[model samples]
Target: GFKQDIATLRGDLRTYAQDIFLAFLNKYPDEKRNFKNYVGKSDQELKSMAKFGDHTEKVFNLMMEVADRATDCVPLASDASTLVQMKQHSGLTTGNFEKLFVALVEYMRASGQSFDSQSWDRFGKNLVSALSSAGMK
Candidate 1:
């Protein structure tokens, strides 16, 4: 079931990113200023950013890759790899990371795709673990 959902997501990650971003901005309106370049953009304009529009796709793809490889389970190697990969945000704080994680989950739910909660739970835990290991908190 988890694998199938990942496949479905891989098939249409653009919409997933868009819905998730909308949820993120709605949930945390204050953070909207983080995208000063994207200010005044329509919802569709922001959604398009998910598709080669900017760095959001990198975050989306990273999560997708992690999910695809985590079919068996989250492991130390994968966690370490995640940490290394996420160093793209070398200055990311624990607070921002937490916000990002929440946005991701909201996006997944908004995607309207069936996914295993336990699997996602494991993935989220591993992500926080990686964040900690990366010295974020």
Candidate 2:
């Protein structure tokens, strides 16, 4: 896939960040327990909360950037440094991270964002390596 594919993904990530995040929470309901600010909120309430928007943007935007570089298997130094701590704080296993990536892929398909198979495959492999190298078990 050309970089243009990722460029398009960037646009969608920004546009649907909130919805994408909500979808993830829906698919992995247990994961919602990690977000203290959103723990007790309904989906509608989550949409209304400032923290929800902030976190949604943060999560997806970072994903966009990281995925953009992922095919090359080059880690995001500043961001990768905290990946270990980030996973630890959320108590997310690598399996959970894999699920998050799968959720992103599924969300893209559901939203009609077209991307070729290789793009995600390459991104997933490299992303796994990045997480593994970070020792984020």
Cα TM-score of candidate 1: 0.71
Name the best candidate (by TM-score). Answer: 2
lDDT value for model 1: 0.63
Candidate 2: residue 133 Cα off by (Å)? 1.9
Using all chains and alpha carbons, the TM-scores for the candidates as numbered come to 0.71, 0.77
Question: Each model's RMSD to truth, in Å?
Answer: 3.2, 2.8
Per-residue lDDT tens digits of candidate 1, residues 46-76? 7665442456656667677766766464635
Local distance difference test values of all predictions, in order: 0.63, 0.68
TM-score of 2: 0.77
Cα lDDT tens digits for candidate 2, 24-117: 7889988866676688788888888787777778777777777665536455655555665674345766676666667766776666546664
User: Which residue pairs collide, candidate 2?
Assistant: none
